[PDB]
Amino acid sequence: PNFSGNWKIIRSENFEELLKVLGVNVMLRKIAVAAASKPAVEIKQEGDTFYIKTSTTVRTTEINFKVGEEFEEQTVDGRPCKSLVKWESENKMVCEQKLLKGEGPKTSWTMELTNDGELILTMTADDVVCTRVYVRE
């Protein structure tokens, strides 16, 4: 199971709602969801080592990690957090994250490939799930 390649989103569910669970700048959502409606994921995998760039218009973030080694990043609302990636199976990984300094809803993100060659990326902030589906472009 190799996740590397250029991915294009073809499906998306419960995203603006997930945002409310965090209480994001309501008004910007239209403008932001308009850019975030087309987030292009670029992945480079080399064993347990991953390079993931998530770009949209006006925004570009990159993360680098190795399965099992903690690293810091940011929650969907911009809060810094320490994260740890574990393998569920050979094609599904799960990231558990915890806020560095502060308090808020418990978050995480899973990532998996299907036999069909689709990248399913879900994000669950507490009990609210947000699913995005990608396809190798």
Experimental method: X-ray
Annotated binding site: 132-134
Nearest to 106 by CA among 23, 22, 26: 22
Beta strands, E only, the chain? 5-13, 40-46, 49-55, 60-66, 71-74, 80-89, 92-99, 108-113, 118-125, 128-136
Q: By residue range, what is the domain housing residue 54? A: 1-137
Resolution rounded to one decimal, in angstroms: 2.3
CA distance 108 to 62: 17
CATH of the domain at 23: 2.40.128.20
Whole-angstrom distance, CA of residue 68 vs CA of residue 22: 27
Name the binding residues for all-trans-retinoate.
Answer: 132-134
Task: Indicate the Cα dihedral angle 32, 36, 55, 124, nearest 10°.
Answer: 110
Q: What residue has token string 């990231």?
A: 95
CB neighbour class for 28 (10 Å; exposed up to 12, middle 13-18, buried from 19): exposed
- CB distance 87 to 93 below 8 Å: yes
| Separation CA 70–CA 108 (nearest Å) | 14
Helix locations, 38-90, DSSP H = none
- In the chain, the number of structural domains is 1
Q: Looking at the DSSP assignment, which residues form a beta bridge with residue 92?
A: 89, 112
How far, in Å, CA of 60 to CA of 39, rounded?
9
Strand order in the sheet with 92-99: 60-66, 49-55, 40-46, 5-13, 128-136, 118-125, 108-113, 92-99, 80-89, 71-74
